[PDB]
Design a protein around this nucleic acid. Structure first.
Lengths: 367, 367
DNA sequence: TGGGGTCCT
DNA sequence: AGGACCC
DNA sequence: TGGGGTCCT
DNA sequence: AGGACCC
């Protein structure tokens, strides 16, 4: 029943991609910006206060030496993202993407195939590659420890190949399910890896400071957990199954309570090609109304080329909005013959507009 | 590009299935009932006024000689339904179900495979099997007429095999798309078949008396069409694309307007095994409230056995309701280990009940 | 106006 | 989750 | 608080 | 269609 999962997490991904394109930014503290935000920055900058998602100003007045590059156009990041995934796919086919810079790979079959290949002998010489989560002692006679170590060896090879073939660094974490692998991948933050032995599971999960830090617990369930008194991971573990059942509903509840013990049975799912391609414009005050379909000609132009390329054709169009959490969409089929340019598409987007701080087009339901 | 589609439509299906089970009903006018309704009756009864979906009383006082059988339990009808479909599948694999008693089969490849097998000779001796829609003359030199005739030959073989192997009669209609095949299957009503030549398409579509008779136009779009003045099929054909576009939305509108010309590009889709299994109880006044989960133990019992059997296991449960058009549901996952009896299931159905004229359970999302 | 079932938003 | 379609 | 993306109800 | 999650 037991699995060996690796979580691969690329360091400051857009900044890496930009640092490869312009090497005069390598030494220099680098911010990648979108509108008013600094969405990511390389190491040099991070250390001098720049962070997470700061202002192009609250972030410049915490570091004047800031280089900025625009990363609103996601194209190159998207391409390198799939290069990474394809590369992990070549190790083992079942790879799951999470955003552009994370991948889970189920290494179970591969770890076993290596283990069967060793003679009862070199097995005593199995070693770990990278850190062991809470500096825990390894027991070479524990079959689960041996498998996880062989998994940390695959992980280090994924990272070496990602570096040698694509020029990217990143972290990895090896554990027995996706929750834990992703929790432990970030213990040694910059370009390192960690393996979690079973005995330190509670240590890792109790090292969290709030239940929002558990992947799967979002902005909204966390506010509901709070309203109940639940704040630490231990409060969640010990809370009444009943009340939570009856309050977040059986599904959400009996799932996030397992997560609070480090238990998570969800399989790594094969992502394969994307289910949709969409593009957005942000702009606060700026869409008057009707005139700003011009906007609508551009996301199309961009998208059309991308949609093209993949080969597969979209059979659904969608348009999205906000005014001054709440966004609206209208969907419709894409007329069959127009599948097989812009012209009629703009038109069907323009009643999808009229039946109805930002605008987007999505191509969904590819075939 | 051109297709040959057959629509197979079983005569008074539940009554046939019951007439096979109890032959002392064969001569006798037979109603199959559910609650207060006579949902179907065989020929003998139909002719003496009994119809469609009448009262067990407004229908008995239009015919006192009525035998009634209960057909609330859909089990045997459901089994014979799939026997029919499997039998048509053996002619050509792409068969689409519509309710328990209709199937579309795309005969295009099969008609061509027969045509290639004939020598330039016997081709002049191709004949039709059954009626030609508006008594239209056949042109043996028209390649579309020849294909449709070979399609009426496949149809007659489907009907003979359905009769010889399963003991069921029914109608068939052969045409160039599903709209037309289904429109023309019912021209000769009891146990006969009709083939539609292209030149009589407008005749058939204008023989309709209201646009609700066009398959795809339902209760709600028909009321909207009315509100616009649109009543005949010809009003719909001639109505402003624009207004209708802008009023039912581009998708519904540009689709039902094509239908009003007899044009319909939708493929016959392979139904294969069912996407869900559900059971219902009706009862007006009767669910007090909480106590009537007892109800909830039964639909389960029934369902569990069925779900079992198919082999494939449901990963989603759902519960449905109405109070005194509008029904409510709550869905949730089925706990993994309980996939692999009743006990915990009733329980997860009973919070799905408490977060919340009739009740039902659905097993969906089989795997 | 039963007792099913499918796909779309 | 709910609407809309079909039998 | 960008500019993407996925699955569920 | 909209909510909820993740990066």
């Amino acid at each position: 029943s037991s699995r060996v999962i690796v979580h691969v997490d690329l360091d400051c991904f857009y900044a890496q991609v930009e640092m490869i394109s312009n090497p005069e930014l390598k030494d220099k503290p680098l911010g990648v910006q979108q509108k008013y935000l600094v969405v990511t920055c390389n190491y040099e900058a991070r250390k001098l206060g720049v962070k997470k998602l700061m202002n192009v100003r609250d972030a410049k007045e915490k570091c004047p030496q800031l280089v900025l590059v625009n990363g609103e156009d996601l194209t190159r990041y998207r391409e390198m993202s799939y290069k990474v995934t394809e590369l992990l796919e070549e190790f083992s086919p079942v790879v799951e993407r999470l955003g552009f810079d994370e991948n889970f790979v189920d290494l179970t079959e591969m770890v076993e195939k290596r283990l069967q290949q060793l003679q009862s002998d070199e097995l005593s010489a199995v070693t770990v590659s990278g850190h062991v989560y809470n500096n825990q002692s390894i027991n070479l006679l524990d079959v689960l420890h041996i498998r996880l170590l062989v998994g940390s060896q695959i992980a280090a090879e994924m990272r070496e190949a990602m570096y040698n073939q694509l020029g990217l660094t990143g972290c990895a974490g090896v554990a027995s399910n996706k929750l834990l692998a992703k929790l432990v991948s970030g213990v040694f933050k910059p370009n390192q890896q960690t393996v979690l032995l079973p005995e330190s599971c509670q240590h890792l999960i109790h090292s969290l400071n709030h239940i929002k830090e558990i992947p799967g617990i979002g902005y909204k369930t966390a506010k509901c957990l709070e309203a109940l008194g639940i704040n630490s991971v231990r409060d969640l573990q010990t809370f009444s199954p009943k009340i939570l059942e009856k309050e977040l509903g059986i599904s959400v509840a009996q799932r996030i309570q397992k997560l609070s013990f480090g238990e998570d049975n969800s399989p790594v799912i094969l992502s394969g090609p994307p289910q949709s391609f969409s593009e957005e414009d942000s702009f606060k005050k700026c869409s008057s109304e009707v005139e700003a379909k011009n906007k609508i000609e551009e996301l199309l132009a961009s998208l059309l080329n991308r949609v093209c390329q993949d080969g597969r054709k979209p059979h659904t169009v969608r348009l999205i909005i906000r005014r001054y959490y709440g966004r609206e969409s209208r969907q419709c089929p894409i007329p069959s013959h127009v599948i097989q340019v812009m012209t009629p598409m703009v038109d069907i987007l323009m009643k999808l507009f009229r039946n109805m701080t930002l605008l987007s087009v999505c191509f969904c339901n590819l075939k």
